Amino acid sequence: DIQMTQSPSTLSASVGDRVTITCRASQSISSWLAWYQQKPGKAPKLLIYKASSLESGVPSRFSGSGSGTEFTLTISSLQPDDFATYYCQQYNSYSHTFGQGTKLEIKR
Amino acid sequence: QVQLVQSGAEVKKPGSSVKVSCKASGGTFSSYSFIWVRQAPGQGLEWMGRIIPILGIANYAQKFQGRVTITADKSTTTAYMELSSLRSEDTAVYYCARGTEYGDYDVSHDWGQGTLVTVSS
Amino acid sequence: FNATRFASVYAWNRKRISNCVADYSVLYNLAPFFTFKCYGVSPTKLNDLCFTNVYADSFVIRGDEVRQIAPGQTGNIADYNYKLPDDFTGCVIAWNSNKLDSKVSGNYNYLYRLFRKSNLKPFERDISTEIYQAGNKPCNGVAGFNCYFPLRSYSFRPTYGVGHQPYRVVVLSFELLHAPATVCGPKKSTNLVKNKCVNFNFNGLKGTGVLTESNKKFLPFQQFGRDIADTTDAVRDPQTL
Amino acid sequence: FNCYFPLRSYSFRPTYGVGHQPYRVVVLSFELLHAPATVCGPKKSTNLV
Amino acid sequence: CVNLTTRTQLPPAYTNSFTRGVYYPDKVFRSSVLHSTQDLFLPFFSNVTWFHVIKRFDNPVLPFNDGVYFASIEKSNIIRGWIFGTTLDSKTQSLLIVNNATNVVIKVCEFQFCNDPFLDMESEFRVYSSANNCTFEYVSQPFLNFKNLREFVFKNIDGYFKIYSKHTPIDLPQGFSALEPLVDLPIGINITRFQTLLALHRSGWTAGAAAYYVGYLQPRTFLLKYNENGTITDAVDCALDPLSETKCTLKSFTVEKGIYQTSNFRVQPTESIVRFPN
Ligand SMILES: *[C@@H]1O[C@H](CO)[C@@H](O)[C@H](O)[C@H]1NC(C)=O
Ligand SMILES: *[C@@H]1O[C@H](CO)[C@@H](O)[C@H](O)[C@H]1NC(C)=O
Ligand SMILES: *[C@@H]1O[C@H](CO)[C@@H](O)[C@H](O)[C@H]1NC(C)=O
Ligand SMILES: *[C@@H]1O[C@H](CO)[C@@H](O)[C@H](O)[C@H]1NC(C)=O
């Protein structure tokens, strides 16, 4: 099995800010990885598949960049609807693992 | 485009098996594949199984042999999972997700609302 | 050529190309060793003549089957998925893409038709998925005996040999019609020189002479200048006006 | 990059089409001139009249 | 699509072309040279058809022939564009030119044109219902007491569409004016008919006073006099009058006293017959 983790576990961001989330696997998984956003209480929606492709309807502001064993998702201009839980999933080889869950919050 | 509807929340004793349904409506059904993914309250995501009914390939998680089986019905255009040997730690919500041939099977383009399955005494 | 995913061989894409300038030399940088078979036209002289439209068809096939994409070829992909006309002109470019279209578990998103009632007329698409009744008993849509699902999947894996690894194939088709040609390649250029007897070319105009600064004032659309004796004496530089 | 080997191979196969099957070519070049012809075709000599 | 039945049927008017309809044949610059060229032109002092718009609603479908000379006396931009095609339906390819307040749109698709297409602030474009196969698009700068006299020449030669244009401030005025090249397009289709496009100011809608004229071109030989600045200043038709033919033959605008040989005449055959054995 591929054991994979994302950094940081919790990140505090603000509206209009540019932030990044990194996601690294144990070994090479080629470019098979997908990203998902989860508002607490509802089902996740996919944003990026193949670590580069932008889904139809997903805003183009979200950016994915990665080759293998390291991937990054970057937000240039953040909006209050971007505070959610971000999840990676690799689909190279069977037993598809997931991410821990990164929470994006405002500064109190 | 495609609406995904799951079953309701179910409460059952751990000594039994649970069957959960998932209906997808929209477009051609023969080009779709179904994955079942878990969501526990105290931690994140874990995938169990992926099914391609038109090509008939089943692939379950390494820690789920002999406990869950997922099948698809063409006439009703639905998917079903049956899980046996319910354990106390197996109380959580289930999401039925769908992948498309145009794109990738492993990725899940659409997601269901989920079913809260709980076990206790 | 750099798209993330190509369509399946049976449902092969069709792309039209017109009103553009193409530099095919870059196509030599795809792979260290790759097939570049061209029919009816020399590859090194594709930057000189030009056509009215270009047709691009891209998909992915098993490696050892690559020889089936040619005029007059026979087999399974040749007659059930993609057939080329015998009187075909253009090029076919196939290169290995094992690093991009291989899954350790195994890719299943690439499908090819296996059973068909008849052969395929060249440049024809068949996306039908209705069950094939091999025998005489009408199964009416069940994959039992003598009833097989026509589409099968290439279980691509990186551990496979070179004879079964996926290969990306792109076919370019050219043709000539009465409509004016528009898809022509680059024409290059050279720095200007003045006050010296030189041989020059200006937009297909040959000549020999001395270029000097001109006091004549052309109209905005005027290109050439002719004297009393009906000879060229004034020219306009295409790059800098 | 941008450094190509200039020689390629004619991967001839019996299953190719007519347009790619090998063809043997022999070019005969002459230099017809008033110099003493050392190569002459089959003809017959005749007595001098 | 909206059907209009408020038309007032009147016969088309006719007027005299005078000496209008001369354009630069090519890209070559010449100064102080009298040059004779054979090409498609509009004959001098010929019939030219006249249409009014005011409740005059004149939108007939005119034949294209080998070329069209289109003149318009107007102010405040009533005319908006043109339509070209063979069947004016999605069965065959169709060409659309429009010039709204934003910019100029050139498009080539299988349009399903409305029976009475037009424009109706004006943002109501009832011109077509669908565009299935689009093969060419182009966008460029806008072309724009009656104060506007707008002149256009449309030609279709071996797959190329040539449009020449001219704009002047002021029946047809008496004068001479060379038409400059404007647009060349590699459309590569067949055109046998065309239709004009107007804009209606909603008030329902009121059409202002405007007029336009349509003439047809055919091949002939002209003599053109370039000034020292390369601008055509005068032209002579070589097939209008015997004096004109003499001027063309001598390649000068003035002929001295005498007798000159111009050409020869021969009566043409009237009909044809055939005789073959039993
Ligand atoms: C052509 O390119 C040169 C340099 O790139 C530039 O200086 C010049 O303005 C250009 N002219 C046109 C007509 O594009
Ligand atoms: C224009 O046409 C009318 C009738 O159609 C004719 O009487 C008139 O002579 C024509 N114009 C000229 C200049 O011949
Ligand atoms: C228009 O031209 C095409 C070829 O350019 C020809 O096939 C067609 O018959 C023409 N249409 C008419 C009405 O003559
Ligand atoms: C030609 O142009 C010059 C200056 O550009 C001007 O002085 C002269 O009057 C022009 N000639 C004519 C006939 O307009």
Closest CA to C114 of C71, C150, C165: C150
C-contacting chains (≥3 CB pairs under 8 Å): A, B, D, E
What is residue C79's three-state secondary structure?
helix
Nearest to B105 among C108, C129, C149 (CB): C108
What would the 3-class secondary structure string for E218-271 be?
EEEEEEEEECCCCCEEEEEECCCCHHHHHHHHHCCCCCCCCCCCCCCCCCCCCC
Question: Around Cβ A82, how many Cβ atoms within 10 Å?
Answer: 18
R_g of chain B, CA atoms, integer Å: 14
Ligand 4 site, residue E31, Cβ cutoff 6 A: no
Residues forming a β-bridge with C21? none
* Pairing mode of beta strands E136-140, E148-157: unpaired
- The architecture that CATH gives domain E13-250 is Sandwich (2.60)
CA C54 distance to own-chain centroid: 7
Ligand 2 centroid, distance to C193 Cα (angstroms): 59
Closest CA to E243 of E219, E260, E218: E260
Burial of C72 per CB tally in 10 Å (0-12, 13-18, 19+): middle
For residue C5, the chain A residues in CB contact (below 8 A) are: 50
Q: Which helix (H) or strand (E) holds B6?
A: strand B3-6
* Token reading at E148: 């506007």
Ligand nearest to the CA of C192: 1
Closest CA to B23 of B105, B79, B98: B79
- Is there a cis peptide before residue C71, judged by omega within 30 degrees of 0? no
- CA E23, E26, E32, E33 dihedral sign is negative
Closest CA to C237 of C197, C190, C198: C190
Q: Whose CA is nearest to atom 12 of ligand 1?
A: C239
Q: Which helix (H) or strand (E) holds C78?
A: helix C77-80
Full residue range of the structural domain in which residue A52 is found: 5-105
Q: How far apart are CA A102 and CA A7, in angstroms?
A: 8
Beta strands in chain C (DSSP E): 15-17, 38-39, 53-62, 90-96, 111-113, 132-133, 147-148, 151-153, 166-175, 197-202, 205-210, 224-226, 232-235
Give E262-267's long-range contacts (Cβ < 8 A, gap of 24+). none
Q: Whose CA is nearest to atom 10 of ligand 3?
A: E190
For the CA of E189, the nearest atom of ligand 3: 5
Residue D14 near chain C (CB below 8 Å): no
| Cβ within 8 Å of residue D27, ≥6 positions away | none
Domains of chain B, earliest start first: 3-119 (2.60.40.10)
Q: How far apart are CA A28 and CA C104, in angstroms?
A: 11
CB pairs under 8 A between A and C: 19
Intra-chain end-to-end CA distance of chain B, in Å? 41
Chain E positions with Cβ closer than 8 Å to C: 24, 27-31, 33, 135-136, 158-160, 180-181, 186-189, 229-231
What is residue C123's three-state secondary structure?
coil
Nearest to B47 among A32, A44, A98 (CB): A98
Residue whose structure tokens are 């894409």: C13
Nearest residue on chain C to E187, judged by CA atoms? C179
Total domain count for chain A? Answer: 1
Nearest residue on chain D to C88, judged by CA atoms? D19
Nearest to A50 among C4, C99, C105 (CB): C4
CA of C238 vs chain E CAs: smallest distance (Å): 14
| Cβ within 8 Å of residue E91, ≥6 positions away | E110
Judge contact between A3 and A26, C-beta under 8 A: yes
Judge contact between D32 and C56, C-beta under 8 A: no
Ligand 4 centroid, distance to E229 Cα (angstroms): 6
For residue C108, the chain B residues in CB contact (below 8 A) are: 52, 55, 57, 105
Question: Around Cβ E12, how many Cβ atoms within 10 Å?
Answer: 12
E-contacting chains (≥3 CB pairs under 8 Å): C
For residue E180, the chain C residues in CB contact (below 8 A) are: 219, 221
Q: Do C73 and D15 touch (CB under 8 A)?
A: yes
Q: For residue E223, what are the CA distances in angstroms to C117, C163, E44? A: 70, 74, 13
Q: Which of residues 40-79 of B touch C (CB under 8 A)?
A: 52, 54-55, 57, 59
CA of C7 vs chain B CAs: smallest distance (Å): 8
Domain boundaries, given as residue ranges, for chain E: 13-250
Closest CA to C166 of C69, C67, C61: C61
Closest CA to B112 of C52, C9, A43: A43
For the CA of E45, the nearest atom of ligand 2: 13
Pocket perturbation via mutation, ligand 2, pick of E47, E48, E241 by most ligand atoms within 8 A of CB: E47
Q: Do A50 and B104 touch (CB under 8 A)?
A: yes
Q: Which of residues 11-30 of A touch C (CB under 8 A)?
A: 30
CA of C4 vs chain B CAs: smallest distance (Å): 10
What is residue E19's three-state secondary structure?
coil
Question: What's the resolution in A?
Answer: 3.5
DSSP string, B81-113: EEE-S--GGG-EEEEEEEEESSS-SSS-SEE--
Residues forming a β-bridge with E160? E157
Buried b (16+ CB within 10 A) or exposed e, E22-53: bbbbeebbbbeebbeeeebbbbbebebebbbb
Ligand nearest to the CA of C179: 3
Burial of E78 per CB tally in 10 Å (0-12, 13-18, 19+): buried
A touches D (3+ CB pairs < 8 Å)? no
What is residue A105's three-state secondary structure?
strand
For the CA of C238, the nearest atom of ligand 1: 13
For residue C40, the chain D residues in CB contact (below 8 A) are: 19
Q: For residue A26, what are the CA distances in angstroms to A30, A87, C83? A: 12, 16, 44
Residue whose structure tokens are 């070994």: A27
Residue whose structure tokens are 């578990």: C105
Nearest to C29 among D1, D15, D19 (CB): D1
Q: For residue B7, what are the CA distances in angstroms to B21, B39, B79, B113, E177? A: 6, 16, 11, 9, 81
CA of B47 vs chain C CAs: smallest distance (Å): 15
Judge contact between C3 and C166, C-beta under 8 A: no
For residue C102, the chain A residues in CB contact (below 8 A) are: 30
Nearest to C72 among D1, D4, D17 (CB): D17
Residue whose structure tokens are 């790059």: C239
Question: Around Cβ D3, how many Cβ atoms within 10 Å?
Answer: 5
Q: How far apart are CA A89 and CA B37, in angstroms?
A: 12
Q: How far apart are CA E154 and CA E163, in angstroms?
A: 5
Q: How far apart are CA C231 and CA A97, in angstroms?
A: 79
Q: For residue E126, what are the CA distances in angstroms to B48, E4, E57, E115, E122? A: 56, 12, 16, 10, 11
CATH number for the domain including A82?
Answer: 2.60.40.10
Q: How far apart are CA E264 and CA E268, in angstroms?
A: 13
Judge contact between A88 and A29, C-beta under 8 A: no
CA of C29 vs chain D CAs: smallest distance (Å): 7
CA of C192 vs chain A CAs: smallest distance (Å): 45
Residue C229 near chain E (CB below 8 Å): no
What is residue A21's three-state secondary structure?
strand
Alpha-helix residue ranges (DSSP H) falling in chain E: 242-250
Pocket perturbation via mutation, ligand 1, pick of C21, C188, C239, C241 by most ligand atoms within 8 A of CB: C239
Q: How far apart are CA C62 and CA C96, in angstroms?
A: 10
